[PDB]
């Protein structure tokens, strides 16, 4: 009914602003002192029975050789991962499909390294990992190929030691960013290929929030025609029954993106896109945000758009909005993020969305609703019947 429908549209607009306010990409910066790069990013692992495990990544890369390399301007990589099982495989294994693209530098105002030439076709890949987490040792072998033209990787991994003592998803980032698609205007910022064929050292520390950490060191280089990733991993301070050693993480996160859900995203999109030209500008994003209480600067609005602007044109195209909302529904929000969403409606911070607060939000968004059909909205969400929406009830409206 067009009352549940109003929860979706308004709810979707609030999680869109949540997405636009978060940092989900792989942020690369030059590190002149090491002749390399450094990176930071946040990974989300869905917890099988509900919630999310965050993994905070810090990364450094260093050329193995003394050839000249490209030190980039600030940019990011966007990564889409799909995990699956080979139904003919009896060993503990993971099948990985990964697409990696560089963006985050807008179009305007101007080279292409020799390493880049090694990546114009399909390149075979080998991966070898030796790990030790809280004294539990394991090895992993992987094979596949990479197609940098489309930023595409296909890789199958076997645990050669028997049972993997951590969940496979926690190893994805560790187990070849030289396969990233860099667009034509950003070819001078591709450190990864510029270091080849002699290769780079890749190091990370990965902090699992409320749990232990991984430390990784990898050598990434050509052995003949093959791109080889050789890794050592050490994990300490894990909890025996946390999400990692207790294996409480989801293996396959669904890309179920229905025609019904796309249509719901288009309804939220059209709240931002008030002139109906199919794109959202800083002006339009600024207008919806001020209407909900917030007061961002031109610069903040430019950054928020930059975070999802795949084509660098300075606006959120409808397809870029569909891409960001698919990510937002594929991976679970932290409690801190759902509470932020709740506080948009819960104006006074008392733990309860009153019908006055919900209308304030609605009529502030230019949504004409009679006291009757505002009450229908509260009805829809209000399980415990107090005529208010508490946190646990909000968390129910905001689910698939
Ligand atoms: Ca580090
Ligand atoms: Ca527009
Ligand atoms: Ca764009
Ligand atoms: Ca465009
Ligand atoms: Ca939310
Ligand atoms: Ca309130
Ligand atoms: Ca209630």
Author numbering: 38 to 147, 158 to 222, 226 to 450
Sentences from the paper on this structure:
Here we constructed the prototype of a photo-switchable Ca2+ sensor based on GCaMP5G that can be switched with 405/488-nm light and describe its molecular mechanisms at the structural level, including the importance of the interaction of the core barrel structure of the fluorescent protein with the Ca2+ receptor moiety. We engineered a prototype rsGEI based on the conventional Ca2+ indicator GCaMP5G28 by coupling cis/trans photo-isomerization, which underlies the photo-switching, to Ca2+ binding. In the present work we introduce the concept of rsGEIs. These sensors show photo-switching only when bound to the molecule of interest.
Several iterations led to variant rsGCaMP1.1, which shows a Ca2+ response similar to GCaMP5G but exhibits photochromism-based photo-switching in the Ca2+ bound form. The variant rsGCaMP1.1 shows a poor fluorescent quantum yield (QY) of only 1.6%. Towards gaining a better understanding of the molecular mechanism underlying the combination of Ca2+ susceptibility and photo-switching, we performed X-ray crystallography. We elucidated the structures of Ca2+-bound rsGCaMP1.1 at equilibrium and the 488-nm switched-off state to 2.15 and 2.90 Å, respectively. The crystal was switchable following 488- and 405-nm illumination, suggesting preservation of native switching characteristics. The chromophore shows a cis/trans isomerization between the ON and OFF state. In both states it lacks hydrogen bond interactions, except from the imidazolidone ring to R57 and E126 (all numbering GCaMP5G; 96 and 222, GFP numbering). This lack of stabilization may explain the exceptional speed of photo-switching and low photo-fatigue. The effect is most apparent with V54 of β-sheet 7 (V151 in rsEGFP2) that sterically blocks the position of the OBF-derived trans-chromophore of rsEGFP2 in rsGCaMP1.1.
